[PDB]
Amino acid sequence: AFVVTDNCIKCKYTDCVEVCPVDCFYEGPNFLVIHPDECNDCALCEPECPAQAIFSEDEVPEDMQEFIQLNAELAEVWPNITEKKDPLPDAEDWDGVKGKLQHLER
Ligand code: SF4
Ligand code: F3S
């Protein structure tokens, strides 16, 4: 499974959903997650993220290991997203800022 980590929060560019063959992205107010059972590890989405926030599960940085479980849980509760939309308004002020997990909205 590929996993969306911290830099997506408060950016949520959604360029990633164009390239997914199985539509396994689920949408939250200011974050996206990848459904771990659905993703066929095609890796097509992780060049496409502007925030470079997608990683192969096995390549998630040590300080972002929380996101693996997080993607798995919120994929169960958030609605599926299949079309690209506009980036959140202030997306590039937040692009690159660390520790945005405290801003996550459910
Ligand atoms: S690795 Fe492929 S199947 Fe998984 S979320 Fe990305 S585009 Fe979809
Ligand atoms: S910032 Fe998020 S919405 Fe997609 S294009 Fe990157 S994982």
From Swiss-Prot:
SUPFAM superfamilies registered for this protein in UniProt: 4Fe-4S ferredoxins
What GO molecular functions are on record for this protein? 3 iron, 4 sulfur cluster binding; 4 iron, 4 sulfur cluster binding; DNA binding; electron transfer activity; metal ion binding
- Return the cofactor note field: Binds 1 [4Fe-4S] cluster. Binds 1 [3Fe-4S] cluster.
Region spans: Disordered: 83-106
Task: Give UniProt keywords alphabetically.
Answer: 3Fe-4S, 4Fe-4S, DNA-binding, Electron transport, Iron, Iron-sulfur, Metal-binding, Repeat, Transport
Residue stretches of biased makeup (Basic and acidic residues): 95-106
**Which residues are listed for [4Fe-4S] cluster binding in this entry?**
C20, C39, C42, C45
Q: Which residues form a coiled coil?
A: none
Domain 4Fe-4S ferredoxin-type: residue ranges: 1-29, 30-59
Binding positions for [3Fe-4S] cluster per the UniProt entry: C8, C16, C49
- For whether the record's keyword set contains Cell wall biogenesis/degradation, the answer is no
Q: What does this protein do?
A: Ferredoxins are iron-sulfur proteins that transfer electrons in a wide variety of metabolic reactions. This ferredoxin could play a role in regulating gene expression by interacting directly with DNA.
Task: Supply the name of the protein.
Answer: Ferredoxin-1
- Source organism per entry reads Azotobacter vinelandii
Lineage at the top is: Bacteria, Pseudomonadati, Pseudomonadota, Gammaproteobacteria, Pseudomonadales
